[PDB]
Amino acid sequence: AAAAAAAAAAAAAAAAAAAAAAAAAAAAAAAAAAAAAAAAAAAAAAAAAAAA
Amino acid sequence: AAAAAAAAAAAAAAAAAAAAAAAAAAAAAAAAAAAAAAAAAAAAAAAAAAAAAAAAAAAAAAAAAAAAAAAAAAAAAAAAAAAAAAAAAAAAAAAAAAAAAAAAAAAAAAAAAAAAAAAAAAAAAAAAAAAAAAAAAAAAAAAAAAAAAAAAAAAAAAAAAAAAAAAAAAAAAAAAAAAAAAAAAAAAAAAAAAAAAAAAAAAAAAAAAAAAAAAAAAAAAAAAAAAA
Amino acid sequence: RDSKRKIIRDLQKQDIQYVEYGDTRTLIIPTDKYFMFSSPRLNEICYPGLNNVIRLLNFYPQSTIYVAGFTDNVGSRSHKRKLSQAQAETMMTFLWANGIAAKRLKAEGYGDKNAISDNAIIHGSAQNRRIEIQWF
Amino acid sequence: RDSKRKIIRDLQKQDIQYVEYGDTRTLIIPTDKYFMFSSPRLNEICYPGLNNVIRLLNFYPQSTIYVAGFTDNVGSRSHKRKLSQAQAETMMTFLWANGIAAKRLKAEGYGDKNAISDNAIIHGSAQNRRIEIQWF
Amino acid sequence: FKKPPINNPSDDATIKLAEAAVSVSDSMLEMAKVEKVITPPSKDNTLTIPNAYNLQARASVDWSGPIEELTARIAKAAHFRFRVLGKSPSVPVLISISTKDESLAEILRDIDYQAGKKASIHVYPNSQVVELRYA
Amino acid sequence: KFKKPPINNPSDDATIKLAEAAVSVSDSMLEMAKVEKVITPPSKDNTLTIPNAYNLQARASVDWSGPIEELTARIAKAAHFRFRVLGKSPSVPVLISISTKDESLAEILRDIDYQAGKKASIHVYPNSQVVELRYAKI
Amino acid sequence: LPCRVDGACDATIIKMMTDLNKKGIKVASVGQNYLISIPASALFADQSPRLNWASYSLLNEIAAFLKQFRKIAITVTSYSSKYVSVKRERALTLARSRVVSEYLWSQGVDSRIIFTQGLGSDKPITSYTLGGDRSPNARVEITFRRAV
Amino acid sequence: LPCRVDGACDATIIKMMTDLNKKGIKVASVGQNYLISIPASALFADQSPRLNWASYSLLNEIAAFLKQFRKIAITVTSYSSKYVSVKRERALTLARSRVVSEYLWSQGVDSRIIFTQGLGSDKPITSYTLGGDRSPNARVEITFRRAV
Fold first, then answer.
1. Dihedral Cα G128, G132, G137, G139, nearest 10 deg
2. Cβ–Cβ under 8 Å, residues G11 and G17
3. Which of B204, B208, B209 sits opposite G45 (nearest CB)?
4. H121 contact partners, CB below 8 Å, separation of at least 6
5. Closest alpha carbon to B196 in C39, C105, C86, C78
6. Rounded to an integer, what distance in angstroms lies between the CA atom of residue F136 and that of residue F120?
């Protein structure tokens, strides 16, 4: 239940509140995850966080 | 005084009177719907310059871009704005959905304001004595002046933050690169450790960095961020 | 006894430089005695320099404020930049929290890239470790 | 002269510690002078410490009583446990037989597993050999 | 009222000595960050704790010597069978554990560690067998 | 009246020449860490093999110069983690010397792990409560 | 020559120990485990991780008392009464203890470790729960063991 | 024997520095960067590259102040307010600074380089633009770094 952006690998997420970053090179566009408010978009392939 | 139709009205600076229960879905381009009671609108519109005002019993669900928002008594909105927002409330409740850029927000009453996406550049939020703002996507310079006995909760990942709480306020901030905090008899909760943090506490004032211990990888306070 | 010449005379006494320069006015604050060591924690025992510098810049309530941080030759260039940036940034928050409106202020860190003395000598590098405060 | 400050002052005089700690109150009784040697036989010559500790805990007639026994590093762990258990258990019977109701009391033996000093030094191990008396 | 710190670099040369100390000690730590070869615990090769109730007995052993005799004796102390697969070389695989009370599966863990790759230990706990493999 | 800003204490020439040796020691040190971290990239942390925990998020403040055993036993004792070692300790002591300021016990053990490079390693298992210290196999 | 006293005297130890117990900072002395217990009224402001300026004098004979012993690890742990939640409370007491240990190794300890931590009224010494930092539960405690 | 003073004393340095600040030639002293700032009223005639005869006394304690330091490169740069154009202005300020550096290496500097240049009000120290050489923007500045 995310909301990706069209740029290089940014995605907001509305489980509670997130604006995290993907990689967009392995292309894990599953659109199905357990998004949490501890910076963890745990998708079907791997896990994504607010990158820094 | 209902008005519920899907057409092209498209030119209406409509300052309606009381009991104007307009659940319209028309293509209102040059729109300013300053209704005074009983609005129950569930539209799919496009406005792009809306300086909307809403008085009591205004439940709305719209996919149109606005420019200004005003609340008077009590409301429940669900709007998808796009470009800019000058918002002010009075004892009401409001929710917004899409990516907005709220430059200034002044809440001097009991305002339950929520925005599911705020992608702005300099969000100045001034709060006075009763409100509850919960706005969280990504700012670039947040200035939260809570002069207030009120609450400003945030998971807004701001790049620079400047939060001053004046008299038993409660502000929950999250700073990416720059954290600036002043508290006075109040509480400022830092939910993310910034790249450079600085917090000053006045009399009976608490700038407690209340991050969740046992994260997956909680980054420790480095040599540039270890303040007392 | 509550004025400009009094407060600049005792900032000479607690060893902070001031320069009058046309419209540009600049305080040079030593980080070595106004910060605890290699940290952005302010040297809390030296509060009357901090109250006296903020008592000085109540006198100029419309000027934009440049604040900038400086180190010397030690450490990595990243450590120079982040330490100078952290100390300038927390002096900027000190002025903001002692009551200057936040869009007057500008914090910026130089890893000794302006370098008012040479770093090859001890007392000269002590002079290089500083905060400049400019305004108009 | 019949009160709390008098009886704690002379338990200082016959060398039993007391701590006031919130609600928790704890007597530290040396087994080396209040027990005959390596035995659960009470040192019968030191009766006025025993009368004075029971005279002290008539003052708290509703608190549950934890009593625990301690040794030092010598002997087998079984000998540590059974000797500390035997000495704590017979101090528990002393308080029960001097008139505390038996479901207030709790005897338990630690083979120096709390260890308020190190056992590597003589006077420290002398401090480790003790009975703690806690109540609320 | 406050004091400054007692050993504080309040002095124009000792500040330079101490910020040199900060720069050498952090740069030593990133030298350690680049040379510190680890392996992740996904691929650590060492034994687990095999969590059977007979293995969580609390034991005590003082020994240096050849691996098969301890793990034979930890098996009959654990009431387990002891299998050996492989061939012991005539230079023996030598361990040493001197612990005075600890847990019995953890013994079998630092025998597997002190063996390294000269030998290895498996525990099958449903069968109640430990085994020692050579290479 | 004219005054330059930093009027510090009187230093002596002992610490003056110690300082201006120490900065070139630090300079040579940082460029060696530069060439080394560019010639092999560090692929991997040690935060996966020492992961953090609630009741490892207590903080500590350490100066220490002795062997690793007593220090890691004291960290695990005040972490309420049971402490073990794997592997026998070598006859030469693996000596660490931690002198750092207000960091949490998990980064204390990460820096202890780093300063005992290729001689020991700290592992922390946080669904259990155990800090272990593994010696090298040489 | 070797030194007789190590920068300390036993008369000064018991002089500070009587003076700290007269000012209400209670020094327990069990074996070689030393406890000094400080009410959080006597140091900080209420529900804040911030020192008062006068309370560094209280920290002055705390630190000059901690001069006198040979010690290996001081642990400083703080806990107060309930204010909002246990999560806000444990953040408060962790910041509380880390601030007072930052001042204590700014000052003179000859300790090798100060461990420092805070708890969420998880260990309260009385059942009487009057208020905020005026509670006698609301306290920091500095415990160590005097080495040899 | 080696020399203690190098033809200079620190009492004379601050004596000239007070006297130059009393006559309005402002000496800034930052690190070892020294700045003496001279208004162009106090040396030249207005909009001219020509010294007045009395202003070489002002250049006398400028040069005797520049005796006192070990220096490598003095740079002297001049700029005034707008008169006709920036091209005429930059020719004026280049001739202005090269005339005052010709007199300064006629006099005693122990500098190895004097760089000398002029600008066209490109760096003005106030926004108040009263006139010609009576402007406080209209100035020459002599900046150097004192070596060791």
1. -170
2. no
3. B204
4. H79, H80, H81, H82, H86, H89, H137
5. C86
6. 5
Q: How far apart are the first and last CA of chain H?
A: 21
Q: State how far the Cα of E74 lies from the Cα of E109, in Å rounded to an integer.
A: 12
Inter-chain touch B212–G92, beta carbons under 8 Å: no
What tokens were used for E38? 């680890």
Distance from CA of D63 to the nearest CA of G (A): 13
Cβ-based neighbour number of residue A52 at 10 Å: 9
Distance from CA of C98 to the nearest CA of F (A): 23
Backbone angles phi, psi at C95, to 5 degrees: -75, -35
8 Å CB contact between D32 and D47: no
Q: Which residue, B38, B107, B117, B110, is CA-closest to B79? A: B117
Report CA-CA distances (Å) from E66 to D135, E119, H16. 54, 11, 89
Work out the burial of residue B205: count CB atoms within 10 Å of its CB; fewer than 13 is exposed, 13-18 middle, 19 or more buried: buried
Beta strands (DSSP E) in A1-52 are 2-4, 10-13, 18-21, 34-36, 40-42, 47-48
Instruction: Print the SS3 string covering chain F.
Output: CCCCCCCCECCCHHHHHHHHHHHHHHHHHHHHHHHHHHHCCCCCCCCCCCCCCCCCCCEEEEECCCEHHHHHHHHHHHHCCEEEEECCCCCCCCECCCEEEEEEHHHHHHHHHHHCCCCEEEEEECCCCEEEEEECCC
Rounded distance between C-alpha atoms, residue B31 and residue B9, angstroms: 9
For chains E and H, having 3+ Cβ pairs within 8 Å is answered no
Closest residue in chain C to residue H136, using alpha carbons only:
C22
Is residue C102 a contact partner of residue C63, using CB atoms and an 8 Å limit?
Answer: no
Which of C15, C37, C76 to mutate to probe the E interface, most E CBs <10 Å? Answer: C37
User: Which amino acid makes up residue H135?
Assistant: S
Task: Judge whether B212 is closer than 8 Å to chain F, CB to CB.
Answer: no
Burial class (CB in 10 A: 0-12, 13-18, 19+), E4: middle
Say which of C23, C116, C121 has its CB closest to residue H127: C23
What is the CB neighbour count within 10 angstroms for residue H120? 19
- The span from the first CA to the last CA of chain G, in angstroms, equals 21
Q: Report CB contact under 8 Å: C118, H125.
A: no
Task: Give CA separation, D93 vs A25, B146, D11, D14, D88, in Å.
Answer: 76, 65, 21, 22, 9
How many whole angstroms separate alpha carbon B101 and alpha carbon B85?
A: 6
For the record, the structure tokens of F107 come out as 């980064």
Virtual torsion, Cα B119, B125, B130, B133, nearest 10 deg: 10
The owner of tokens 């925990």 is F53
F2 alpha-carbon distance from chain centroid: 45
DSSP D35: B
Cβ neighbours of residue B122 closer than 8 Å, sequence gap 6 or more? B103, B139, B140, B141, B142, B143
Contacting chains of H (3 CB pairs or more, <8 Å) are C, F
Of D83, D104, D92, D98, the C-alpha closest to D47 is D98
Method: cryo-EM
Sheet holding B187-190, edge to edge: B93-96, B112-115, B132-135, B151-153, B170-173, B187-190
Nearest to B117 among A12, A38, A39 (CB): A12
